[PDB]
């Protein structure tokens with residue numbers, strides 16, 4: 001009957017992969033605070049009792065990695081062995097070297113900033129959809145908000161049995177509308193969250209429905225047929241890195257569009273602007289959102305790609321799902337006349353030397369807080 | 382004029398992320414050889430001189446991790462300090478614990494195999510396209526074949542300056558055809574490959590065009606306008622983990638569809654069949670390829686999703702790009718009548734206790750070697 005289901009997930013600040021993303025971006029921010037031109041490629045790994053930093057940094061900054069890592073873990077909420085992880089007493093191991101000189105010479109040494117080469121080859125996508133004001137899929141927006149609500153109720157003490165590691169998943173029934181999509185109802189919600197040894201399962205399931213789901217999801221989307229999977233494993237006392245190893249860049253779909261649109265594969269966290277995996281994906285989001293908010297499309301996917309050492313993108317592509325009166329070729333021409341997607345120009349347009357990256361590393365990089373890539377460009381055409 | 386560009390990338394066996402995927406799957410295979418029911422979640426991290434294994438394994442097998450890791454690195458070709466990495470002398474560190482008992486009790490303990498719960502929540506996609514016989518995008522097929530050719534010419538000694546770490550990227554111009562896509566020509570090729578200190582840049586660029594590209598890419602796709610970026614960084618002597626940290630699950634788009642279709646975010650390597658990130662993505666590929674090879678569609682995207690501890694998928698969705706006379710609802714009904722996407726049934730249909738996983742961990746998991754998920758199911762409708 002013209003309807004379909006679509007599912008997206010999100011994870012909380014204490015999910016072990018997301019811990020790693022936040023630490024990687026805390027390290028990036030610490031460098032950028034002192035050296036705006038720091039070259040940073042910081043991967044983090046987390047397992048029981050351990051944060052390991054591994055990668056490549058060339059920077060004039062003097063960074064105390066023990067302090068930066070432990071402060072990030074403190075903020076997430078892992079502050080006691082009873083919770084499975086403690087910033088005060090965990091192991092922090094560092095395996096960081098300089099950036100390869102072969103990369104440096106091929107990318108940025110003795111190059112004018114605007115003409116810096118891409119820091120790697122790769123492909124990146126941006127996406128926007130008019131189904132929400134923030135131009136994001138409803139599935140992923142709701143999933144993120146459910147994790148944020150859990151963290152809020154943990155931190156305000158009203159659900160003191162909550163721990164930081166959580167996952168959520170939202171399935172929405174949609175109608176198709178000339179290539180655009182229209183949310184109808186929420187079909188299924190999953191919530192799994194780490195908890196203390198004392199609270200019982202029925203108390204948790206009742207609280208997750210009444211204090212989390214109902215606080216977040218408009219009642220108009222929930223009905224007698226909605227399916228709830230709340231603490232479906234039955235027990236989640238062991239959690240965080242103790243329950244599951246974490247790595248940076250293992251939540252790339254949570255970080256972006258929740259399965260909608262597409263992904264080029266590259267992780268965001270721990271990387272400075274010369275790594276186009278991040279900067280060009282942010283720019284592609286900016287393009288996509290500019291096209292939708294500018295009234296040219298209702299829904300759009302943008303691809304860009306690069307070669308290491310080369311400034312201009314190798315390819316740019318626009319896919320509008322049939323949601324514009326203009327052809328995709330016409331939209332591509334508008335994009336090319338209004339945007340300069342060299343990394344050394346993106347950095348200026350999106351202010352990408354500013355140390356705001358830890359703020360991006362939970363709850364998605366897009367659709368929130370009026371970051372520069374979320375402020376549409378006025379298009380001339 | 383109805384044409385568009387699309388870009389995909391691939392990486393070689395010695396790319397540091399791919400090293401980690403191959404080691405993770407070597408560990409999985411080693412366990413499965415002795416214990417077909419091993420529960421494995423093995424992440425690998427690589428940096429200069431180091432392989433670290435971190436994660437969770439519960440298994441009756443007795444596995445010599447030092448031997449398994451070093452044999453995998455040997456096969457890749459890192460056998461001397463002059464190449465940046467040596468299986469004989471690198472550090473192998475192990476941070477492996479049992480699977481969380483809370484996960485085990487919620488997923489598989491005291492469950493009938495067919496009724497085992499999904500090992501996690503999540504979403505997964507399968508994709509197929511009739512543009513090649515193997516039902517894969519031409520962009521990604523060509524990119525993989527370029528890396529395979531590099532490894533072949535390295536191993537046969539005809540380009541003895543080659544080292545194992547490589548990346549390739551292919552941009553194809555396509556025409557749209559009633560929702561299907563038709564490749565026209567290759568617009569741009571990138572190849573970057575690690576090399577010895579003695580070979581010069583012009584020799585490498587000439588060999589990459591004449592002995593690699595021309596050996597792989599049909600001449601009909603290459604013309605006077607094709608752009609070549611061969612060793613675009615100018616120097617790539619430092620490579621492998623020394624040049625760039627590697628982690629398991631950081632090449633998920635290379636592993637799948639090269640930007641085409643969609644991805645749910647979950648990595649494949651190092652995981653047994655109860656981790657639906659892998660098994661349900663393989664099953665979704667199997668569904669998609671069955672629909673295309675069965676003549677029901679020319680191009681199709683399949684989504685499935687799960688909740689931890691629950692056997693049946695929470696959602697199934699079919700998107701045919703307009704390439705079927707049947708509606709998406711009709712195709713979904715055909716899928717539901719022909720496939721059982723419980724993980725404890727997928728394991729039987731796709732033989733997922735068999736230790737063949739290291740073979741999947743380079744050159745893409747799909748479109749090759751007639752693995753069970755590549756053999757179409759005959760559909761009844």
Ligand SMILES: CSC[C@H]1O[C@@H](n2cnc3c(N)ncnc32)[C@H](O)[C@@H]1O
Nearest residue numbers: 016192233235236243244483484501
């Ligand atoms: C199943 S392991 C993958 C993720 O699922 C979550 N998880 C861990 N243990 C459990 C559990 N017992 N029940 C439900 N989810 C869990 C954690 O966020 C982990 O990172």
Ligand SMILES: CSC[C@H]1O[C@@H](n2cnc3c(N)ncnc32)[C@H](O)[C@@H]1O
Nearest residue numbers: 102103120397573614616617624625
């Ligand atoms: C740029 S670092 C990311 C990837 O690019 C490759 N790479 C590393 N060094 C170089 C180099 N000097 N030139 C081109 N590619 C490189 C390696 O495959 C690495 O994993």
Ligand SMILES: [K+]
Nearest residue numbers: 244245246422
């Ligand atoms: K893991």
Ligand SMILES: [K+]
Nearest residue numbers: 041625626627
């Ligand atoms: K890296």
Ligand SMILES: [Mg+2]
Nearest residue numbers: 017245246250
């Ligand atoms: Mg993970």
Ligand SMILES: [Mg+2]
Nearest residue numbers: 122266267277
């Ligand atoms: Mg990358």
Ligand SMILES: [Mg+2]
Nearest residue numbers: 398626627631
């Ligand atoms: Mg990588």
Ligand SMILES: [Mg+2]
Nearest residue numbers: 503647648658
């Ligand atoms: Mg996963």
